[PDB]
Amino acid sequence: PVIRKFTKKNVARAKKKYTPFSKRFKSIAAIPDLTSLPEFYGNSSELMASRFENKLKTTQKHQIVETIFSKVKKQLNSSYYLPARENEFASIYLSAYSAIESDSATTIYVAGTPGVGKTLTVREVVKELLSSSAQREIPDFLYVEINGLKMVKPTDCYETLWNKVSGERLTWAASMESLEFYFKRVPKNKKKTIVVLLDELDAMVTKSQDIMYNFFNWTTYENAKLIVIAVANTMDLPERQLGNKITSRIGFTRIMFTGYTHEELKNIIDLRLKGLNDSFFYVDTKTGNAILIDVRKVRLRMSADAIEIASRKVASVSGDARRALKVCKRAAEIAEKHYMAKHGYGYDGVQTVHITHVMKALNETLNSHVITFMTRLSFTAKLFIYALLNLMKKNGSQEQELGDIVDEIKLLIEVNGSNKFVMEIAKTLFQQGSDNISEQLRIISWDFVLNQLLDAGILFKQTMKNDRICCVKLNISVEEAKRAMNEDETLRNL
Amino acid sequence: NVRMMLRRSMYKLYSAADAEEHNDVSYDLSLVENFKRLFGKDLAMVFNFKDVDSINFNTLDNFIILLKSAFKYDHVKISLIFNINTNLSNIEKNLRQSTIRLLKRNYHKLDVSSNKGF
Amino acid sequence: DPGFGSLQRRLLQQLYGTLPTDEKIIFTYLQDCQQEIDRIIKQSIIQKESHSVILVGPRQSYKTYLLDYELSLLQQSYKEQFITIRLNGFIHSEQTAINGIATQLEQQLQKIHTISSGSLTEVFEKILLLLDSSITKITVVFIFDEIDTFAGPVRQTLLYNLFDMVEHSRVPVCIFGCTTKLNILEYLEKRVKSRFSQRVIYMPQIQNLDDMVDAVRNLLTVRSEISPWVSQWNETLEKELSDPRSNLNRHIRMNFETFRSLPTLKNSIIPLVATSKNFGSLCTAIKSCSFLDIYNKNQLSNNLTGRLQSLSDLELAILISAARVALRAKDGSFNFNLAYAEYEKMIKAINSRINTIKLWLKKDVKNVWENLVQLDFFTEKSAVGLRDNATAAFYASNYQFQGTMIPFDLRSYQMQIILQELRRIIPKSNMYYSWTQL
Amino acid sequence: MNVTTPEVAFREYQTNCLASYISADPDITPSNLILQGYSGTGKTYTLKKYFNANPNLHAVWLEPVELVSWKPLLQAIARTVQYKLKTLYPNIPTTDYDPLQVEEPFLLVKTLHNIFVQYESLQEKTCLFLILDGFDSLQDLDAALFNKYIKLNELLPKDSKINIKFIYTMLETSFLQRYSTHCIPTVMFPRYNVDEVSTILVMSRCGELMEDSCLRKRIIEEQITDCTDDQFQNVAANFIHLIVQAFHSYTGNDIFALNDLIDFKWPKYVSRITKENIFEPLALYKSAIKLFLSTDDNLQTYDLSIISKYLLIASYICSYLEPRYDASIFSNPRYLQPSLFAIERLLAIFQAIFPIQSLMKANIEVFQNLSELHTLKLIATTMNKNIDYLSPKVRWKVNVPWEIIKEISESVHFNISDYFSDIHE
DNA sequence: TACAGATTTTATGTTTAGATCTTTTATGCTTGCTT
DNA sequence: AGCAAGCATAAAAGATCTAAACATAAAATCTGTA
Ligand SMILES: Nc1ncnc2c1ncn2[C@@H]1O[C@H](COP(=O)(O)OP(=O)(O)OP(O)(O)=S)[C@@H](O)[C@H]1O
Ligand SMILES: Nc1ncnc2c1ncn2[C@@H]1O[C@H](COP(=O)(O)OP(=O)(O)OP(O)(O)=S)[C@@H](O)[C@H]1O
Ligand SMILES: Nc1ncnc2c1ncn2[C@@H]1O[C@H](COP(=O)(O)OP(=O)(O)OP(O)(O)=S)[C@@H](O)[C@H]1O
Ligand SMILES: [Mg+2]
Ligand SMILES: [Mg+2]
Ligand SMILES: [Mg+2]
Known part of the structure; x- marks a missing residue:
């Protein structure tokens, strides 16, 4: 053997071929009808995903309680119609239907902020198209969904798509060449329409931007029946990555998904609770199980004003359709927790989700814990930040050398030594309350509180060998620290 | 740096031992530790520092201190040969006193020059 | 007697927390958040509801402690209804976390009843297929420590995929992420923020002295009759904690002011109970707490004061001279030449004011200089001690610094202890005390 | 406790803490324990003594200083853990996991899990201790x-x-x-006092010194007769005490430096022993004062040409003296870093100071000598990897101390001190 | 005609050579001034 | 002629990074020929 300069003992390589599709057949005229072959468009793999389904199932379960608020919590889920996206679902469906009926190619670029219903309405468009094709109104098509954030490498866009259209497992470059040949060269008499959803296209094009160009270009070929539905967070990503000339050449169909208004978001939440709001339940007072129509006949209600305020706050802040649903779900969870605590139901007149619960759910997200965190900090850490603020006042500088904090702490302890608390804490701060311990240059727990503040994200310390010149600066607003050490009486007096 | 000096020393040692003897190991001092088990013969490494003046003396000092850790094995002998283009006073100034005292235990001075003594 | 040995072992395993989960002690000040942790988990393993919670709190804030106590409590009665995957941001990478998840899934699924075979692409695809799809579903519980390290600014695909599993998957998934950052929400990208449920639990803090007093009482009270000394030990501990003037209460108060952390106190107390040989010695040690003072003195024995108190006459003189030349300099920097010039000036003046202090030469002071640099009394003028990352350390190792190129005499240093600190520490009876006031 | 505390000479608290933390019961021993201290503080000695006094504690000693980077550390941990486990339990059938497959910390976790799951046959839980002697000593x-x-x-x-x-x-x-917020139990090892260092040195070296070959030959060569068991031990103890009280200021509380000094000075001290001075230590000390007056820790500085020597002289003069040469000369500021200059100024100063023949021009030989001087690092530039000597932005500086340039100047009989005496002596 | 054995393809790992950048001190220039 | 103070700014040292050169390796694929 040969002595190896280094070794790679954990190299794992997949069984993926190298020869592209263009070399498999003798000539273009020799390509068979790929539509009827049993491996290309899903005619081979139908139960491959079902192989792992049985691995996460168990045969043991007790009679779990279903609280009256459990239905509301379960219904206000991301998975769980389409109230507001009706002038945009219509556009996507019209474009895709026109492309499918004529065996043509197109590109739809839908862009918007998170949580505004892009992927949901694209999936609904695809479902409606599949239903229409199942009635033989439009030619049958294969739906491929590619998510840029669900792939280890950005070049797995090809490995997936080819595998979803041929059943073959090739490398990424071989898959790219195979897709180029398939779209450009294969006649339209031996193909099926393909609807590709490029969810989170932002992550795919981040280093070489060739995924965007390849996927948009394949919709320009006459023989290609590809339909690309691109989803991204920025409205001008192709204009930047590709350039104005290329994007003008491709000819997108551009759609913008604006954030939801308070009324639309309220309508979404109301439709999510259509059969549950103002409904009736049978509740077992012994165990707490609630059944929708010693039993008790109760009424479940969620106040419309709570939905008003939640929708308005979410629309003003973000406009997410996920955030309002999560706020309502958290309010329902708070109400359920209080209900179970009052009645002691545990696990295994009328009930309402009050405005206070939604206010608590919003305040949980909005409020910051920095002021509360510092209010309960140890006196040494509070003295540290007090000296930092004093140095900031004196110098007017954001970054203070650690030696300045040390000297300021010593000066603060010395100057107001007539104060009872300082007089009784000086010994425990400099000698650890012991006569056998010499006076310490740094107060007790100096490193402890310094590292505590650094880890908490309150301070930023530049990395240097000299510990007396390292500059620590507050990573928060100064007013927060001002309030935090104004709350404490000892540091306020001195 | 020290890591590459150690890796290039252990790679040369393993290659030479395999060649003279006619699996895999990690290129660090554990090879020196396990040499007696691997090859069944004692070890007599002889280091030759070609241009000591050009070598950074910080990493050279660190490498010498690292090699000192190999003295706890009964089957290893380590010799060093510094090819110096100047007097050794520069090396004395550029090395730590601990390393100077470590080297002073056994050292021989040789005046190697083509024109030496005319 | 074996009774005291049993009592001491029980006390030590109470302090370490390795006592059985049937009798694990939960401090009152953190008995509240546990309920929340008890609720969420019991809403995911029993009721099969997905959850995404982030526990924010400082180091040793009982995040992993509570999160493991709750899993152990749920383990004995719902053993087969959930599996646990534990990830740590320190030892797991972005590529490595996929392998960790796959291996833990396969191990736990064989334990309850491959996924880890192939490339990273195949492994990730298989774990997505399994998770991100009479008889119920096994709950997948992610104990995901240091969530802030996998919430970087370049790409967050693991967190994105995990939260998407929480929302849009038919298998119930509970994801607990422990972190110390108070602004963990702003670390996540906006897609991940939207996918996250914004359920952040801020771990409770000790805001009272009675909180630590009760925590110590819980830690040091033996509630199981296993030794003849248990009743007397409880009596002694209660009478030493009731009176506020006792030494134990004094040390608890000092910890409250300075450190405010139970782990530090139990680290101080563990050798206190392990060192005692019989019950009488343990009672005297808990009544006087002398070993607490000894431990505190030892902990502060390698800092600047402790290191300074272990310097010879020549090293102390060189340090004082270097402090003087750094105080005189505008940048606080100096070198061997200036320090030795000041040292020889000081020695000449001291010998003139006069049994004579020897003046060592440059070759005999180079070793002292190196020794003082080793103890980090001096550092380079602009030196970074240790790089935060491994890549930064690698880059620094590749670069050849200009400080090592220049000769040893002219290397520019900079101190960590200023002359005023030397004046404070050094006793007034020293020969060089007049030379610590420039 | 069933743990026996060894009687270490000056580490009583440290040994007590080690016995308190390191125990054979996994329930009452910390996951991480730290020993802190500087060189010569007896931490590895204390831990070795403690583990030798307790053969029932399983220890896997590791030396991170040999394992420069993290990957060798992980691989060595994986190798040594399984090797030790096989050594303790050779009757357990186990499969061999290659340590070189450990390339990530998670890979170490997986390998350790796979090694530990095959030892479930044991009746009671055990703990083996991975001692990492010098985790601070990793180079990378x-x-x-x-x-x-x-x-x-x-x-x-x-x-x-x-x-x-x-x-x-x-x-x-x-x-x-x-890592102070991790609350890891820590045992501190303060540096020894002068008395502690002296006692450690005598108790560690007196036995070896009294049995040294040089003393064996000296006692028979001097025809002396005395108590072999005690007098030679007293002689060695007195020698160690003299060494300590003479070089404590120079070395400090450093055991290794004093050990090196003892090793260097013992043969010379024993070569001065004879019949009369062995019995009275005062006479023996007076007969060997020169040993204890100089540390002697050191083991025509350059053979450069006259052109190279004058080039170095001109470079030093140019760098350490301000460009005020125009006023009087050519027809300490040396305590700071050398300044920077250009090639033309160096050549002009070299021509000015070079002895006449009537002036020395810049031949190929002068430039070759200058480039060699830069090669030997005696003269440096503002170089960064790639260096181009011909760039006008490249400026030169000196890398010799005052002593070397003074010796060079006196070699060619040049008075550089007179030139530099204007600002200060 | 199937073959092992040699080669290529795809996929990361290790190390050195070269780049741009911020950060901080040196530096020529300008202003004011006396020999 | 000779020089102190203020200013802008070219520059040194080094953090941070890229990428070519150097290196290893499993799967597929070319290549002989018995
Ligand atoms: N029009 C709507 N009607 C009802 N529910 C909606 C509507 N829009 C969004 N939602 C809900 O909010 C969630 C938002 O998911 P998406 O539609 O994927 O949002 P998004 O545009 O994909 O945001 P990204 O992917 O982070 S950029 C859906 O899963 C639904 O639960
Ligand atoms: N599984 C456990 N069982 C018992 N005690 C534990 C356990 N894990 C940790 N502890 C102890 O609990 C105390 C602090 O709790 P930890 O959970 O370790 O701290 P923490 O909240 O995890 O801080 P982090 O994770 O480093 S940010 C220490 O004394 C630990 O020894
Ligand atoms: N208490 C002691 N009693 C006797 N000899 C001791 C004592 N402490 C140290 N020594 C000796 O002095 C030397 C100290 O060696 P170590 O204990 O290995 O030093 P160290 O503390 O490990 O420092 P480093 O970082 O390993 S160089 C050895 O030769 C010991 O035999
Ligand atoms: Mg989406
Ligand atoms: Mg933890
Ligand atoms: Mg050691």
Whole structure:
């Protein structure tokens, strides 16, 4: 053997071929009808995903309680119609239907902020198209969904798509060449329409931007029946990555998904609770199980004003359709927790989700814990930040050398030594309350509180060998620290 | 740096031992530790520092201190040969006193020059 | 007697927390958040509801402690209804976390009843297929420590995929992420923020002295009759904690002011109970707490004061001279030449004011200089001690610094202890005390 | 306790803490324990003595200084853990896991899990201690490796019959204080006093010194007769005491430096012993004062040409003296870093100071000597990897101290001191 | 005609050579001034 | 002629990074020929 300069003992390589599709057949005229072959468009793999389904199932379960608020919590889920996206679902469906009926190619670029219903309405468009094709109104098509954030490498866009259209497992470059040949060269008499959803296209094009160009270009070929539905967070990503000339050449169909208004978001939440709001339940007072129509006949209600305020706050802040649903779900969870605590139901007149619960759910997200965190900090850490603020006042500088904090702490302890608390804490701060311990240059727990503040994200310390010149600066607003050490009486007096 | 000096020393040692003897190991001092088990013969490494003046003396000092850790094995002998283009006073100034005292235990001075003594 | 040995072992395993989960002690000040942790988990393993919670709190804030106590409590009665995957941001990478998840899934699924075979692409695809799809579903519980390290600014695909599993998957998934950052929400990208449920639990803090007093009482009270000394030990501990003037209460108060952390106190107390040989010695040690003072003195024995108190006459003189030349300099920097010039000036003046202090030469002071640099009394003028990352350390190792190129005499240093600190520490009876006031 | 505390000479608290933390019961021993202290503080000695006094504690000693980077550290941990486990339990059938497959901390976790799951046949839980002697001594060390090693114990199985307990003996307190919020139990090792160092040195070296070959030959060569058991021990103890009281200021509380000094000066001290002075230590000390007056720790500085010597002289004069040459000369400021200049100024000063023949021009030989001087690092530039000597932006500076340039100047009979005496002597 | 054995393809790992950048001190220039 | 103070700014040292050169390796694929 040969002595190896280094070794790679954990190299794992997949069984993926190298020869592209263009070399498999003798000539273009020799390509068979790929539509009827049993491996290309899903005619081979139908139960491959079902192989792992049985691995996460168990045969043991007790009679779990279903609280009256459990239905509301379960219904206000991301998975769980389409109230507001009706002038945009219509556009996507019209474009895709026109492309499918004529065996043509197109590109739809839908862009918007998170949580505004892009992927949901694209999936609904695809479902409606599949239903229409199942009635033989439009030619049958294969739906491929590619998510840029669900792939280890950005070049797995090809490995997936080819595998979803041929059943073959090739490398990424071989898959790219195979897709180029398939779209450009294969006649339209031996193909099926393909609807590709490029969810989170932002992550795919981040280093070489060739995924965007390849996927948009394949919709320009006459023989290609590809339909690309691109989803991204920025409205001008192709204009930047590709350039104005290329994007003008491709000819997108551009759609913008604006954030939801308070009324639309309220309508979404109301439709999510259509059969549950103002409904009736049978509740077992012994165990707490609630059944929708010693039993008790109760009424479940969620106040419309709570939905008003939640929708308005979410629309003003973000406009997410996920955030309002999560706020309502958290309010329902708070109400359920209080209900179970009052009645002691545990696990295994009328009930309402009050405005206070939604206010608590919003305040949980909005409020910051920095002021509360510092209010309960140890006196040494509070003295540290007090000296930092004093140095900031004196110098007017954001970054203070650690030696300045040390000297300021010593000066603060010395100057107001007539104060009872300082007089009784000086010994425990400099000698650890012991006569056998010499006076310490740094107060007790100096490193402890310094590292505590650094880890908490309150301070930023530049990395240097000299510990007396390292500059620590507050990573928060100064007013927060001002309030935090104004709350404490000892540091306020001195 | 020290890591590459150690890796290039252990790679040369393993290659030479395999060649003279006619699996895999990690290129660090554990090879020196396990040499007696691997090859069944004692070890007599002889280091030759070609241009000591050009070598950074910080990493050279660190490498010498690292090699000192190999003295706890009964089957290893380590010799060093510094090819110096100047007097050794520069090396004395550029090395730590601990390393100077470590080297002073056994050292021989040789005046190697083509024109030496005319 | 074996009774005291049993009592001491029980006390030590109470302090370490390795006592059985049937009798694990939960401090009152953190008995509240546990309920929340008890609720969420019991809403995911029993009721099969997905959850995404982030526990924010400082180091040793009982995040992993509570999160493991709750899993152990749920383990004995719902053993087969959930599996646990534990990830740590320190030892797991972005590529490595996929392998960790796959291996833990396969191990736990064989334990309850491959996924880890192939490339990273195949492994990730298989774990997505399994998770991100009479008889119920096994709950997948992610104990995901240091969530802030996998919430970087370049790409967050693991967190994105995990939260998407929480929302849009038919298998119930509970994801607990422990972190110390108070602004963990702003670390996540906006897609991940939207996918996250914004359920952040801020771990409770000790805001009272009675909180630590009760925590110590819980830690040091033996509630199981296993030794003849248990009743007397409880009596002694209660009478030493009731009176506020006792030494134990004094040390608890000092910890409250300075450190405010139970782990530090139990680290101080563990050798206190392990060192005692019989019950009488343990009672005297808990009544006087002398070993607490000894431990505190030892902990502060390698800092600047402790290191300074272990310097010879020549090293102390060189340090004082270097402090003087750094105080005189505008940048606080100096070198061997200036320090030795000041040292020889000081020695000449001291010998003139006069049994004579020897003046060592440059070759005999180079070793002292190196020794003082080793103890980090001096550092380079602009030196970074240790790089935060491994890549930064690698880059620094590749670069050849200009400080090592220049000769040893002219290397520019900079101190960590200023002359005023030397004046404070050094006793007034020293020969060089007049030379610590420039 | 069933743990026996060894009687270490000056580490009583440290040994007590070691016995308090390191115990054979995995329930009452910490996952991570730290030993802190500087060189010569007796931490490895204390830990070795403690583990030798307790043969029932399983220890896996590791030396991170030999393992420069983190990957060799992980591979060595994986190799040594399984090797030790096989050594303790050779009757357990086990499969061999290659340590070189460990290339990530998670790979170490997985390998340790696979090694530990095959030892479930044991009746009672055991803990083996991975002592990492000098975790601070890693050459390629950052601030994140110890964070990995602290939490390594969490991902390993909790109910395994083989528990891993890490012990670190770090060197610098500045590194330890970075992880002060982790609340890891720590044992501090303060540096020894002069009395403690003296007692350690005598108790560690007197036996070896009294049996040295040089003393064996000297006692028979001097025709002396005395108590072999005690007098030679007293002689060696007195020699060690003299060495300590003479060089404590120079070495400090450093055991290794004083050991080196003892090794260097013992043969010369024993070569001065004779019949009369052995019985009275005062006479023997007076007969060997020169040993204790100079440390002697050192083991025509250059053979450069006259052109190279004058080039160095001109470079030093140019760098350390301000460009005020125009006024009077050519027809301490040396305590600071040398300044920077250009090639033309160096050549002009070299021509000015070179002895006449009537002036020395810049031949090929002068430039060759200058380039060689830069090669030997006696003269440097503002170089950064790639260097172009012909760029006008490249400026030169000197890398010789005052003593070397003074010796060079006196070699060619040049008075550089007279030139430099204007500002200061 | 199937073959092992040699080669290529795809996929990361290790190390050195070269780049741009921020950060901080040196530096020529300008202003004011006396020999 | 000779020089102190203020200013802008070219520059040194080094953090942070890229990428070519150097290196290893499993799967597929070319290549002989018995
Ligand atoms: N029009 C709507 N009607 C009802 N529910 C909606 C509507 N829009 C969004 N939602 C809900 O909010 C969630 C938002 O998911 P998406 O539609 O994927 O949002 P998004 O545009 O994909 O945001 P990204 O992917 O982070 S950029 C859906 O899963 C639904 O639960
Ligand atoms: N599984 C456990 N069982 C018992 N005690 C534990 C356990 N894990 C940790 N502890 C102890 O609990 C105390 C602090 O709790 P930890 O959970 O370790 O701290 P923490 O909240 O995890 O801080 P982090 O994770 O480093 S940010 C220490 O004394 C630990 O020894
Ligand atoms: N208490 C002691 N009693 C006797 N000899 C001791 C004592 N402490 C140290 N020594 C000796 O002095 C030397 C100290 O060696 P170590 O204990 O290995 O030093 P160290 O503390 O490990 O420092 P480093 O970082 O390993 S160089 C050895 O030769 C010991 O035999
Ligand atoms: Mg989406
Ligand atoms: Mg933890
Ligand atoms: Mg050691």
